[PDB]
Amino acid sequence: DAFKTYLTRFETVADLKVVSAYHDNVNSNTGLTWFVGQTRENLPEYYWRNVDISRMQAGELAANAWKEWTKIDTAVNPYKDAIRPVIFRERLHLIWVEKEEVAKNGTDPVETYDRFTLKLAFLRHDGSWSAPWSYDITTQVEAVTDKKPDTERLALAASGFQGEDTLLVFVYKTGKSYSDFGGSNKNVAGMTIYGDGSFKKMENTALSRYSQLKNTFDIIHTQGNDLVRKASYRFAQDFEVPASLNMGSAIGDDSLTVMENGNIPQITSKYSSDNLAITLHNAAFTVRYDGSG
């Protein structure tokens, strides 16, 4: 009987199917890929795991590079399959969209409409999940789906702009290919989420900035109507360079002197034309006559 209960749990875990993925790097050579998965049974039960693909050698991944499926317990009820992981503030966030049926008050003919809400939670230090931040994206969803979300597959993409400490959330209409964002392109809408939970809807100028991110959007296969999901990626402009560098301390010859407080607080990058310029601001260090005891 105990083995049969174990088999029930085993079947539940083995029946999981991956639904979205995020790569925590600007390129696919190193980093972690985080997957969210869904159960076969007709419940909104979601699990998550990750894999270290830096261990890939000729396409073979060792079994220890993978991680156990861990269940998310925060009352997630996404709309269709618009749920995906993302990492910003160096911790695992879960972002999804919910749909509700609302009516406008004070109209003698009661007309109903779908309200689309973007929810965002994060994973706390002890393994629990926070209370999700909630935003209204009904206008963006309607604009990208041309007010036909029943016929068009609404899609969600989330990327982490670590250089600005922000979260880029795109809502788009799943197609075969995508053009550059902003202006004439109305099938993609953008939102920017800050570290405190506040949000700003992106305009055309800022939307044109992240146009190279369209390669990480889900597309419908040309050969047969087959969906091919794509891992979202951490975003950077052209090169990702750390924003600071704590150089450390050192002890000189004969234990006479010490170099202390060596750090570069600001490191900025500029990629104009095809030359990269890296600026180190306020690089400082202290020299002191001191033996370490």
């Binding site: 450390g248 301390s249 010490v258 202390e260 001191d290 370490s292 005891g293």
Partner: protein, 49 residues
């Protein structure tokens, strides 16, 4: 300071000597501390001390 010392005291009371040593070396280690692959210049690891 206060949390690693409490953890060290509880581990010492339960007689988990190696774990207690690990938990008190966050505050003080007579052998020094290895930072960036070298012995750090400070004597105490707790900065206010």
């Amino acid at each position: 300071y206060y949390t690693p010392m409490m953890c060290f005291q509880r581990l010492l009371q339960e007689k988990q000597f190696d774990e207690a040593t690990q938990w008190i070396n966050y505050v003080y280690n007579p052998a020094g501390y290895i930072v960036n692959g070298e012995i750090a210049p400070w004597i105490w690891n707790c900065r206010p001390l």
